């Protein structure tokens, strides 16, 4: 089978806490004796439009931060600011702290999101960092602080912390070091995402998965060069295809016997002529939120 | 903002997954208190997979022939029993991570989260629905037999599915936690056909309501219809008949959006007869039937678990 699959969330569920600064409530990440959370928590309703975070933080004390891990209360013994992320040292180290790493992902790579509200998880889904450095997720009010992660052999690579919803409905956030993905800033102001492109290498991997799963009607009798495909791709707002992408798609080409540049020719036709109707792997669209690695792991 | 296929948090179920080995046949199991529940095909060998006599196969099995591994810890089987297609192994140690739980039998159309496990170790979680043909369209590889399906209702984990086999058509089939298969399938390596599947109508309507809640409203039309006249069109497009209970389940969503069910049915009637003409709904160019009305409430205007 082939379905959008997320990593097991257990290791991340036990690191989620609620952080309250006055009335402003959000979610936080409890790793060892430090609680990581968005620094927008130190803002009040009148500070959200244009905040001076250095001035807002200098007036705060350790006792101004309420951190709750369920019914358990944690005592803040130190506070610091790293870019757009607030770090609260606490008296107790999280016993359920997993082996972890803080990674900064690049557009096209995927991750699992644990949507949390008031420190309590609500659901898990998979989503990708769009080339415009936004993410298409499902977030409601209070989701600020929810994290995105990948798990590789019991090690959880934290890569995203949710911050804000953009006017277009897409979402924007930071890495676990506070540096935003994209040109966005933590302020309650209208910030436009930008014209998004389609992750080409991911689309091809999904087409390879369809061949592996029976759907092979899109397969044509043509081939092309990387340059002529990139010419066609640019017209339909598709990301450029590099030799790196071709080499990563090697395993998928091997299992199917379909050369990468031939799959590019099939995608070129699907773009130039259209899809008229019909479905591929359960979709009438071309999916770009499956990395080549995700496809191999599932198929 | 946004709408995605969302699964329940898997933590409570991850701590109940164990590996069960009978001689060499290896599977996954569910460790709740002092009982490990697992598919009974584990007692079959390579020559027993086609037509096994499970009563006789178990009569030749002893407690020491079942190897159950809870992570690195070894569990001692102190008793074995068979309930329908489920093997139940009493163990010496009660699972300390046993959550508050229930065993429920779901009905076709209802959804649940699946924790795909291999050799006792979870690997991924996804959401899927019990198709009207009593199969499930999932992502399972070799060794997935034993993976469980669940819903979480405020700290209570309702176990509803245990994976058994992949059917020749590529779909998947399994049982409830009392051993009774979903559908007319049997635990043996024989060619078993699923049957013609229909589209869960009430789920499609709930998904359209979810789009109204999330901004997509281009499909909302100026027409209305009756339940009977829609079911005439529904049957034509291989859709399940729409009942008054389905209408009543869509009650909450209709109020929140201000759109009557029969009006949404008329828009669906048009979407079925006319098409989607390129347009997208909630990020999809097809009509989704794997979102129950409760799933929309959970995701749209819903919170913790
Ligand atoms: C609908 N939606 C989708 N994603 C989000 C994420 N998100 C959020 O969860 N909360 C936000 N504002 C807050 C208001 C508060 C009121 N109280 C009492 N406490 C509050 C805490 C927060 Cl964080 N925002 C808005 C927002 C948050 C930021 F971190 C930021 F830099 C700019 C912003 F405009 C938000 O987007 N909601
Ligand atoms: C590709 N795929 C998708 N879903 C599945 C589920 N599934 C499975 O995981 N394993 C199965 N056969 C086994 C072989 C074994 C070899 N050893 C050493 N131990 C084994 C244990 C099992 Cl279960 N099967 C086949 C199958 C399993 C049953 F429980 C059944 F009743 C009939 C069947 F044909 C399987 O479908 N694999």
Author numbering:
A (entry chain B): 2 to 300
B (entry chain A): 1 to 305
From the paper:
The main/3C-like protease (Mpro/3CLpro) of severe acute respiratory syndrome coronavirus 2 (SARS-CoV-2) is responsible for making 11 out of 14 cleavage events for liberating and activating the viral non-structural proteins essential for the virus replication, and accordingly, it is an important target for antiviral drugs (1–4). Clinically relevant SARS-CoV-2 Mpro inhibitors, including nirmatrelvir, the active component of the Food and Drug Administration-approved drug Paxlovid, and ensitrelvir, which has been approved in Japan for the treatment of coronavirus disease 2019, target the cysteine protease active site of Mpro to competitively block its catalytic activity. Multiple studies have identified an Mpro mutation (E166V) that confers strong resistance to clinically relevant inhibitors, including nirmatrelvir, but the underlying mechanism is not fully understood. Glu166 is also hydrogen-bonded with the N-terminal Ser1 of the dimer partner to stabilize the Mpro homodimer and intramolecularly with His172 to stabilize its active site.
Of the several proteins screened, Mpro with four amino acid substitutions, namely, T21I, L50F, S144A, and E166V (hereafter referred to as QM for quadruple mutant), yielded high-quality crystals, allowing for structure determination by itself and in complex with nirmatrelvir, ensitrelvir, and bofutrelvir at resolutions ranging from 1.71 to 2.33 Å. The E166V mutation abolishes a direct polar contact between Glu166 and the edge of the triazole ring. However, in contrast to the case with nirmatrelvir, the substituted valine residue does not cause a steric clash with ensitrelvir; the Val166 side chain is positioned 3.7 Å from the triazole ring of ensitrelvir for a favorable van der Waals contact, which may explain why E166V confers less drug resistance than E166A specifically against ensitrelvir. The S144A mutation in the QM also causes a loss of direct polar interaction with the triazole moiety of ensitrelvir (3.5 Å between Ser Oγ and a nitrogen atom from triazole in our Mpro E166V/L50F-ensitrelvir structure), although it does not significantly affect the positioning of the inhibitor. Overall, the structures suggest that the Mpro E166V and S144A mutations affect the binding of ensitrelvir via loss of direct polar contacts. Notably, in two of the four molecules in the asymmetric unit of the Mpro QM structure bound to ensitrelvir, the Gln189 side chain takes a bent conformation and makes a short-distance (2.1–2.2 Å) fluorine-amine hydrogen bond with the trifluorobenzyl moiety of ensitrelvir (cyan in Fig. 4B). Mpro QM showed the smallest ΔTm among all variants for all three drugs: 0.5°C for nirmatrelvir, 1.5°C for ensitrelvir, and 7.7°C for bofutrelvir, consistent with its strongest drug resistance observed in the biochemical assays above for nirmatrelvir and ensitrelvir.
